Ligand binder design. Structure first.
Ligand SMILES: [Cl-]
Lengths: 74, 74, 74
């Protein structure tokens, strides 16, 4: 029951979205610093392999869409 | 009178809190290591600048309180 | 009154699982690069101390199990 629980539940999800967005921004800056460092060691791909291409996708729009849906279907 | 969708949602949110707090602590340890490495290069902030002071906030209290609130609706 | 929401909640959680799974992988790769760079300076543990022995755990199974339980505790 309690379909007004939705705002609370989605506020929790919105807080997680803020947290993961910050984690993403920060971890990418760490890679930026690492890339600089490995430039004279052969470059990041030389050290990590094709794994150097892995980047965290920004799921923000899909998450906000699902949050909106919960509110909409309460 | 069986609303427990929130019960399990709450538990799922708690697992995610544990997982994200771990990512934050680990990513920050990575920056610490990076700061050491960039010392003789002028420091991290002279390589990242308009981004270097960025650190993930700890949203634990905010998330925990929101979860306690949801739990508090029954 | 409506379990489209129980499906939507599970769906937002799955989005967050993919998002955090990507962050964990990327972050661990950043540490891999950092471990390589710190090798000549005594090793990561020499620089970070016992904190060097921590890694984010993979909560995939734990989270997927909770997500399923939600669909079943429908
Ligand atoms: Cl990182």
């Amino acid at each position: 029951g309690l379909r007004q629980l939705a705002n609370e539940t989605t506020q929790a999800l919105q807080l997680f979205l803020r947290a993961t967005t910050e984690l993403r921004t920060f971890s990418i800056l760490n890679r930026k610093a690492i890339d600089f460092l490995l430039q004279r060691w052969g470059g990041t791909c030389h050290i990590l392999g094709p794994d150097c291409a892995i980047e965290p996708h920004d799921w923000t729009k899909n998450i906000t869409d699902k949050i909106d849906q919960i509110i909409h279907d309460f």
